[PDB]
Point group: C3
Chain length 364, copies 3
């Protein structure tokens, strides 16, 4: 019988708290300082209520459908309300309950990334309707595909902490939203700060254990965020003549997003190069609300492609799987992106249409 | 010789930091956004200074008198300044020093819950006087009774993380206070957020170890808070036509309070039902400063009663003690509530009277 | 082969996150509420960008030059980009990578303490230039001397968590700066709160392990901060007739600074006495931006001297080294202070002069 390691339990519970902290209040405060002042209270309210909702859907069927025995695309409905999960059931080296909470917390930040951006111009019941649809039909299957031993995992896709699952996923759902004035920067700074601190639970907890890989993912997190800040600020300086607080924060986020899939597979060299490239591509991206999805999306993609590179032992990475060339890993990452982009697309489109046809989309 | 487990040490120290974070700045910021703007600075000051004071009383005699060898009601004065506690002394599976800090942190949030609410209309030296009296004569004996193997423990009272010790206790002391405009909701949101994040140290650290029970209490924490938010917001929507940010936050707190005694004894089913019922009863409660004590009090009681139910193996709980019916456990919880309510009553009354007769109660 | 303990890994990673949290956003928010409103955005920006920079210099050569095989004053350039540090390399009882991050995080808060104070009246490129110079030529050698088995360590200097390395060091660099209106106190309160919470990672993580010494340093942290608050507030009350929020926060910081070198070597008795003395000396100090350095400096020195005392087994301490009198330990602490003060002096002076002669110091 697999036996739980209390060091890992402790690490994973604390990491889960940190990920929770990313949404409550990190992303809430982040947008809070960015959206028009008359909309903050309502936005803060829609994030909190949809967070609650995402927590509940998860314990009811979310976890089971994402992580239960299933097919290439979804699990089962045989862990409803966590039935048939023994309290002492182990998963990896931790109790399965901690796996339930940790993964659930990722589902939350994904949703809050979308709700925060779209709370301004969406009717409440519409967003609620949306959350249900998209969590169930996009976050869950994609989570199953990447981390639940579904299609993408069984093809060897390297995505440590959710470049596709959290980032590209939410970014698409958000931009379909868009398709269908910064008043408190200190508050934006604060939310960003909290996102960065939580993000350590996020990337490092993704090791499932307090080992050398969690150590690697942690260090790399520091490195990429730092690299991205400077790459962004230098870009901002070169373009605009000077850094701004918003540029600085945005850079942090570019690097964090960009390193998300890679943190556990790459060397600090890899971490730094990925940070710089993510900062600049982010900055390039916003140049070419809604912007957030250009950062998550662009930097999400850039990270996933570059994982397919810096995982190489050659470049200081942990190495690709046996018999996997860097060429092949690159095809694989590209295919995972293409799926994520397309899957989230159809589902969000469906999400908004159902809402639109049920309650109407734009605020009364 | 009992030997300390470094995984538990680590978990418990981090949990202690989280509980500390609940008071500094969680509760301070919570009230900060709620009380009149002209009173915030002074309130923030009275919380910080009484926090310091509670830390000091605890190391001087508080811990020993709450957790030392004693009678049914109080310990001893043989751990003054932690004398006769070996640095390597173990308690449970952690070093006793970590037990000192963790428990001390619970004493703090209890006090800060009261000071925050009453800083507006109480003279400083009066509140100080009060803190000394009530910490010494109410928090300590009740802590001894529930967790120090006193009267209530030796009768089998289920109270995992302080439904009686923290909640009903403070709520009564506060309402006796009362008996004798929300200007920054983002700040209220922020404090609430911090309280929720710390609350994981609070409920889960109450396992004393990073085991499956800490896992259970953590998951349940997420579940109950979520359930409570929705139960509250739906009530608010049904009554008032729409949710508010304050309702949302309040719901979070209803669930957190409501699950406090139960988190370690109940199934996720139990967690959810307790959350919903606590959200609604909270909302019902505030309907029928000062409100905070209606939430802590009502939801404190509701949690303690419902623990006496959902602990049953029958309902997905960990099970009652051997030879204990659910009927008997219900009598026991009810008696613990009745004691807590009454004990805190007399003591707070005494607290305020001494202050009143020494320095006067209302601000000069 | 030395083998990594996952409990310690977990503790140390979480402690590193907490220390990071001290700078992002703790110190940023602290100053944010203190400096003129027109300067906050730019200050927040200079802290974030110099944080990024300090993270990068550290991974490139900082860590190796501070902690590599070297002389009495500096390490080597044989861990460039962490080359020749095996991913599984162990240090103490944790993976060396966690040692890289943890120590790196101390470098950050040191820098942010200076940048925060001087962002108002220094040109950006000047501060940047400065950071590079002073981190490389002062923080690093002093870190090597105290913690990297250099001059000061090999003479038996007791400095648990950086009374000299972080505090006196930064305080001097800052006051040389000076030598060459509080608008949001709630924000000051918030930053202070975050600094205190992070500070537990800071003092306790300095054990390198979740053991009884980390337990001791944690408890003492609570004790000294509490003692300092009251010692300060009582001083403020005695002098000014009443406490202020700023006094309360400042006291917290006096105690935290004052206990920094001592937390791991002294009894709770020692902790309390050191807190009180640090609160008062801090308050005395500010009486006799820029003030911050009077608190860090004075309380830094007071802590380092008093460590040389309360480490004694006689006074409840862990005891001095074999064959070391308390007299001798006192000479040693005094010499460490004198070196730190003088070393940081010359280096900061050089830092500002280079900047001045390159880009100019005062804002255009």
């Amino acid at each position: 019988p697999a036996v739980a390691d209390k060091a890992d339990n402790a690490f994973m519970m604390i990491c889960t708290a940190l990920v929770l902290f990313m949404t409550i209040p990190g992303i809430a405060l982040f947008y809070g300082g960015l959206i028009r002042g008359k909309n903050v209270l309502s936005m803060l309210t829609q994030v909190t209520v949809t967070f609650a909702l995402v927590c509940i859907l998860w314990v009811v069927y979310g976890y089971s459908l994402a992580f239960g025995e299933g097919n290439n695309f979804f699990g089962n409905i045989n862990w409803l309300m966590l039935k048939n999960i023994e309290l002492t059931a182990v998963m990896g080296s931790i109790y399965q309950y901690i796996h339930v909470a940790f993964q659930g917390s990722f589902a939350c930040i994904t949703v809050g990334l979308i709700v925060g951006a779209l709370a301004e111009r969406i009717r409440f019941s519409a967003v609620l309707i949306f959350v249900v649809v998209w969590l169930t039909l996009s976050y869950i299957p994609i989570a199953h595909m990447v981390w639940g031993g579904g299609l993408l995992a069984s093809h060897g896709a390297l995505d440590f902490a959710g470049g596709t699952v959290v980032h590209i996923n939410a970014a698409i759902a958000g931009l379909v939203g868009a398709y269908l004035k910064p008043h408190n920067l200190p508050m934006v700074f604060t939310g960003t700060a909290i996102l960065y601190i939580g993000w350590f639970g996020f990337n490092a907890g993704s090791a499932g254990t307090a080992n050398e890989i969690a150590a690697l993912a942690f260090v790399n997190t520091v490195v990429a965020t730092a690299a991205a800040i400077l790459g962004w600020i230098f870009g901002e300086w070169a373009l605009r003549g000077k850094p701004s607080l918003l540029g600085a924060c945005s850079g942090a986020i570019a690097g964090l997003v960009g390193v998300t899939p890679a943190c556990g597979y790459i060397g600090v060299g890899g971490a730094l190069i990925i940070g710089v490239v993510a900062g600049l591509a982010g900055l390039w991206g916003v140049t070419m609300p809604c912007d957030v999805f250009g950062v998550h999306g662009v930097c999400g993609i850039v990270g996933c492609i570059m994982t397919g590179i810096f995982a190489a032992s050659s470049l200081g990475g942990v190495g690709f799987a046996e018999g996997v060339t860097m060429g092949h890993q690159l095809l694989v990452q590209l295919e995972s992106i293409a799926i994520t982009i397309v899957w989230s697309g159809v589902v969000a489109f469906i999400g908004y249409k159902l809402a639109d046809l049920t309650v109407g989309l734009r605020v009364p």
